[PDB]
Amino acid sequence: VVTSYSQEITEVPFERGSTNSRFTTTLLVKRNLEYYILRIFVPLFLIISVSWVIFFLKDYGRQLEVASGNLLVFVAFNFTISGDLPRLGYLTVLDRFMIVSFCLTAIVVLISVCQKRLGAVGKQAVAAQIDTWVLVIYPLVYSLYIIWVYLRFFTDH
Amino acid sequence: TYTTGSFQLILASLEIKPEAHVQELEIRLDKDTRYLTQHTRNLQPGDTFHALVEPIGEAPLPRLRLTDSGGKPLAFGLIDQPGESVELNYTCDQDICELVVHVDGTDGQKDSGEAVYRLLVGINAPNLRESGQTPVGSSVFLESDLVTVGLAVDQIVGVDQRSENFSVVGTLKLSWHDPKLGFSPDQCGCTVKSFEDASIRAVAGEINLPLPSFSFYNQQGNRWSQNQVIFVTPDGRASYFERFTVTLQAPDFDFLAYPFDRQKFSIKVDLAVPTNMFIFNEIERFQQVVGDQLGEEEWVVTSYSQEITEVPFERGSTNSRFTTTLLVKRNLEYYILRIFVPLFLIISVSWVIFFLKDYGRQLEVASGNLLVFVAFNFTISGDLPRLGYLTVLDRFMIVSFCLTAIVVLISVCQKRLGAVGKQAVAAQIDTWVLVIYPLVYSLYIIWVYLRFFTDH
């Protein structure tokens, strides 16, 4: 969608000395943000929200199995959205967000394994402490990463 | 400046002797060069030509001859009474006759090594040797025209890694000085003659004078040329400018170390005319070679090098070649973060499931994680290119998949052992794999680094 346009006339150097005229029409185009927000970001938010909410469970076997299933879900959706994501040779803020979210889901699977191990040992209190700690640091980490990428790519510093 | 040209008027004489001048040449006879010829000027009637070759580092005594433009004999070579050196003399009888001097070891075909000979060639000069004032006079040999070439790359349009080619857009500039292209500005009333939308071959065809036509050596298909222009000045200065989008075939793509491979994009411009006519003399840095782009790029140019050589040409002799080599590298952050970190976490969960002593949950998580590995493996299937051979990334993925299959197998065996009643050996297997799995991964990483990124 064309946000704005500007037609303007300049002079630029020409072969064998001198200059020639140039007429430039610049179109300030923008992508459809609703498409990417609804198709990608809302399903991704729900996929990470289920991984966040599995920590309320104190049955760490079910927690671990749901965590592994949700990581598989994350991968399947990740590649379901593979046409809109373009095959450029470098990274992208969407790509960085997806990588970070995938890493956080891998970490939730790891933490679920560790918590099941601790519960099997007999240290249920520390497992509950880890549950309540992750329940508060996970959204904090996501928010900090969102702010950091906004600062890095959409403003100075 | 003074001016030169051919005119008509609607004879007399000059002094008592025509201008006499001599030059020298060091000719090297090697395995790849056992014969040489050199062309000369018009040699107006009455002019005498003298030639004399001598050996410096040895006494091979290469034979000499003197022929016309077409090779018909005009003068032979007779050795002098004193040892070493030869003498050849010829006086012409017709106007505008070109002479070619031939040096050849036809009888001396024995090969031992490179040799150097000093050849003294003069016109109108009956001097026995060089004597003095050798460089004051004009050159007697026909000298190849000097052309300066400059290449710049605006951007790398694309790389096709399966057919091994790359499309690049840039600008090419040529500049030579052929006075035969000159004109008097009185007639046209302008200081520049312009040819547009036509290649050098076409303007050469419609002018019928030799011009330094070129070609992109590894070009595939039709090059897309624009702003194609040729400017000619009355003083003979001619310049060619072109902005080209060209797909060049690259037969030296080595994707064995992908995505850590570093490639060499070679843009070769070959002169279509032989070395005796035109040669790429120097390189014009009219603008930066790599150029500046806004935003990131799939291929980043580590370094560039423009260099001029001579390569063999069809029907004997050589032609000049101007090569621009770009040392391009992939974006390592993209492949490290998109592929290697998720893969590390996927293998790390399979590693960490061994702490569990509930082997049913261990087995189910192992199977689920193998499915996860497959799903991610094919999620990263666009960046991974469909080449017909293996790749260090492909080898790493195969090894990791095999290790996840092995962890599933070990989980099955451990559940079986626990069901039997041998829990102690199952715990021993747990603690053994917990230490050998990272060791195996590290050893494989070191091995592939040694195999593909260094010697042995």
UniProtKB/TrEMBL annotation, chain B:
**Which keywords describe this protein according to UniProt?**
Calcium, Metal-binding
All disulfide bonds of the chain are: C92-C97, C188-C190
Q: Where does Ca(2+) 4 bind?
A: E164, P251, F253, E296
Keyword presence, Metal-binding: yes
Asked if Calcium is a keyword of the record, the answer is yes
User: Could you tell me what this protein is called?
Assistant: Uncharacterized protein
Query: In terms of domain of life, where is this protein from?
Result: Bacteria
Tell me where the transmembrane regions lie. Answer: none
Residues engaged in binding Ca(2+) 5: E164, E297
Query: Which residues make up the binding site for Ca(2+) 3?
Result: E164, P251, F253, L294
